[model samples]
Target: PDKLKKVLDKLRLKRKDISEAAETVNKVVERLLRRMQKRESEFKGVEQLNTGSYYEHVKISAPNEFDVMFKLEVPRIELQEYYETGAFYLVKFKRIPRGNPLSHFLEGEVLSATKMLSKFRKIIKEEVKEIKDIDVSVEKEKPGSPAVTLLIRNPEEISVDIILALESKGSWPISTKEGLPIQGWLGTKVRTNLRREPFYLVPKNAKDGNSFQGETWRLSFSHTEKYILNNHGIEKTCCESSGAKCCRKECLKLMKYLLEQLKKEFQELDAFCSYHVKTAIFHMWTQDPQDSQWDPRNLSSCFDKLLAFFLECLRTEKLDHYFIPKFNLFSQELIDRKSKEFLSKKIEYERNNGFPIFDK
Candidate 1:
């Protein structure tokens, strides 16, 4: 219990330092946007959607990394499911309006992700050079990565992943008809309102990198995810100053920290990301959806329950995306089966042995 508490405290970010980091990063983004708007007509409509753990306040450790989505407005668009799981889509224009800069990047009415991303990459590369003060440069692309990584040499390495996303309107796809099982947790009205909100699509390919990879865009629900975690109390005032406190976020942070440490120790577990940890928590919320069940005083017990849920998924070799049930996150195509078993055993050992990794 003391170890868990200590680890949580360790994970507490230095607010002032983080604020400074954000200030620097935000300034760079502002300059980047300014330059992008001036350089490209289509980019002029780009709106920034700040997602990920840093902006979501579930960020652990130093604020050296950030995720910023540049959402390009795409009106009157149609989507076709590229992957059988419905997680990936091929974006096509219903009507190409006159003076549409994106029309140049289209391949047979379908928005070519490769063509668009290449231009986006070129623009960022050029703009980073023009920025006055910051020592920022575009990093080499990682295979199958959607973000145009910016390496900020603030004397220390700070990476900002800028994802080019399409701001999608209208109803979600048919595949997600059965997903987002939060009606029992957040109520029907809340779920309906969230469903009504705009979802985003980023230029992403499948794990195997298919032939249609350049044309595919993966669905993103970071905004909705941020909303749920921030307002995640059964009661309206669950985490408010006047309301009782809950340990939901704390539990998540602990698990994320453990995962981070484990990944460093076991290179085989590299396929697992923090988003996987986040997805597990979302699923557990629906199963045990009570604010009182996550009382701050019972942090240890609550975290154990959360950890058990993760272990269950690992053992079963099944972890579904929160908004897309058919997309098995631990599918053999993405994650190796042996790694899942290896992770489960390691985690169980940590849980039984007082999580000694946190001490290091």
Candidate 2:
């Protein structure tokens, strides 16, 4: 009779353990599904082009595995006429004096300004060729710079397009390396003025009979605004609290803070992935945020915290086959959904706003 009782007790305990394990797996699966849904919704329309009717006639050609290149042209005079023209002509000739060469100079300036785009294309071709699925061909006038429009076809492919513009020689000093223009060297006049002095202390002199100091301010401000909108779906509410608008300085500070947070979070995740058993846990958590809802603020914070948590867990203990079976049962839908929702909003904004600026 005692042997029979012992057998019954063992069966009851086994049943209880099975029930607990089932409940845990269900909870994890539910959360994962929610996150996946949110991510899918966020990134729904992220890859559509934003070109107006202007791109209707442009031909698209496949350049490589990742991008389609469009060929375009810029009109400029030949180099011979540029240096030969002089004041030897009559007074009327002086007034009209061959605008062709001047136009070429303007075109050259525009090309130089777009050197960053060339650099970006080269980077894509070299380091990230597999991900560069779309190409852009642009024909622009002497608008002082060249710009490329990007259409993302896959969110899993690449993170963001990096845009940069060449610096102007008027208000800012030029760099010796690569013959590019920069704001200034360390402790240089322009740098010192910008970094140390208050905005009021800087002189408001107009060098080229223009009130604005070239296009630096406009370029920097616009680039930052577009970057946030395209990379993350958050519309900037700069200066909404007060009547005064936020300047470039303030905006830069905010960007710096956000970047630091991301760096720290990614580092933690990297550490967590180093472990075998904890690696499985890491994957499960990575499938979704704890909260399935799509709040950019919350999603951003949770991403950081979860990354950190995994790192901590991996460093503390070893994971076993027991944990792997449970972790593998979890779904990835919740995280996917959240990411989709965020990316979708970003895509919609870009479709309406056009390509982002990269001010030097």
Candidate 3:
């Protein structure tokens, strides 16, 4: 529709905002990490890697937000499943002869995301307070959030979410088998390579208030998501300067925009996040949209197909965690029935009506 073309046009970043965002992220996150390493011995080897839609080249609208994963690579830690879906865990320090430096962060035997994240927050807050020129401060921690968010008000609001994670290189929990099923879609090699890469356990907790699952760290496949998106095309180099162009990234951006608009109209969908649209697109890409379906010229149908897929998943309450099949993304424990019914009806309407949301 013409409205969609306008939406696509509006999605491009301002030329100046690109450089501004680049400088803002590097200057703040980098200096903060450096100071953290210097002042705290435990964070000495922490590595910073940028993730999220902005870094992955799928970011749309204003460039006022970014995500940086401040990864702390821990050695041979034991993971106890704190939640049945294998999405949340209680990280335990091993009793090795040489000993582990991170053992100090452990309470009893399990590492507490709540404890470590609060400490990380205070360190970053103090660091920000000492800054000379920039106006930055640590925002109030949201309940059950794993990110240490920083808000910068330099002419405009620029928010950054700093995630602290412990990297694990061991075998993926067996619960992830049926998830990321891409052999028939993206070839077996892609699945093998993606699975071989290390997975992250972020300092995230489920807000369900179940005492049995408190202090649980959630698994993050952000790096894997980045890798797959960068080398997105089945043949590789799909959207390069010299190669073919597909509507994959554009579809994601569009759906994200659509969802954002949808959320504004009805607050009931506060639970369905940007990640749901992203995961649905990943599944859509693997479901035979290779070339003929997701052609640049076929953006309208491709977008509709993606929206339809999302609606189907919501209607059936079958949106599994992309990295762990057993973890139902739409489980009642996660999303209420009111949200599911509301999303299904609204999405079905948007799909059939040419998504009037784009007009707004």
Candidate 4:
């Protein structure tokens, strides 16, 4: 119990450190965005979707990773499901405009994520060269990866992934009819409003990696995720200075930290990411939807229960994507069975030993 508290204490990021890093990154990113707007007409409407752990205020350790998505506004479009999972789609324009800046990337009626992402990368790289405030370099593209990473080395070392996304404003696709099970947690009104908001599609390929490798776009509810995490609590003012304290974010941070430490000790668990952990917590919220359940006073117990839920996911090998229920994040195709078992056993060991890994 004492150890958990100590670890949580250390997990806290210093405000000064965070502010310094955030200011530097924001300066460079803003400048890059301005340049992008001036360089391309389509990019003029580009809005920054600051979606990630850092923006969500759940980042542990150094504030080095930033996920800044450039949401490109698009005309009304139809979603063509690339896979049965409904997580991947082929976005097609409903009505092609004569002067559409994105028309160049369209093949027939479908918009190619690969072509759009390529052009987006080109624009950013071209604009980044003129960014005089910071020393930054665009990292080479990774196979099946959606992000255009920027490695900055001036005041501090931080990697910012600039993701290109298409913002389709309308009702969500039919595949997500049963997903986002937040009615019991965040209320029906909240879900309705969130659904009404625009959804984003990033150029992320499917796990199968077939012919449509780069052409596929993955559904992202990161903005909604950001809202939920920031305003998470049964009470409207759960984390407000005048409201009751909750350990929801703390539990998340602890699990992420534990997973991070475990990965270092076991390289086979490389496929595992913090998104999996966050998805598990989102699932748990549905089952236990109350502020008292995540009372900050019971930090140790709440964190333990969070770990227990994650362990259950590993054991069952059925961690569903929060926004796409059909998409099993822990599928055998995505993560090997041996690694799952290894992770389950390792977590059990930590639970039994008071998490010695946290100390190291």
Off by over 4 Å in 1: 13-18, 52-63, 97-100
Clashing pairs in 4: none
* Candidate 4 residue runs with Cα over 4 Å from true position: 14-18, 52-63, 97-100, 207-210
Q: On a 0 to 1 TM-score scale, where does candidate 4 land against the true structure? A: 0.93
**TM-score of candidate 2 versus the correct structure, residues matched by position:** 0.18
Segments of candidate 3 deviating more than 4 angstroms: 13-22, 52-63, 210-214
Which stretch of 10 consecutive residues in model 3 shows the poorest summed lDDT?
53-62
Estimate the TM-score of every prediction: 0.93, 0.18, 0.91, 0.93
Local lDDT at 76 for model 4: 77
Candidate 3 TM-score versus the reference: 0.91
| Residue pairs whose backbone atoms clash in candidate 3 | none
Encode model 2's per-residue lDDT on 68-172: one tens digit a residue. Answer: 112111122111111111101010111224452223222222222223245434433332233223332222222332333233333222212222322221221
lDDT of 3 by residue, 1-360 (tens): 466767777766434456776687688878888878788566777789556445224433346776678998887888888778886788886667887776666677888676677677887898889876788888898865677889987778788888888888787867787778777657788899888888888776567666734468878888888877777786665888878988888888888888878887898988887888888888887786465567889888788888778878887888877788888888887899889999888888887788787676
Ranking of predictions according to TM-score: 1, 4, 3, 2
Q: Model 2 Cα displacement at 200 (Å)?
A: 20
Error of 3 at 294 (Å): 1.4
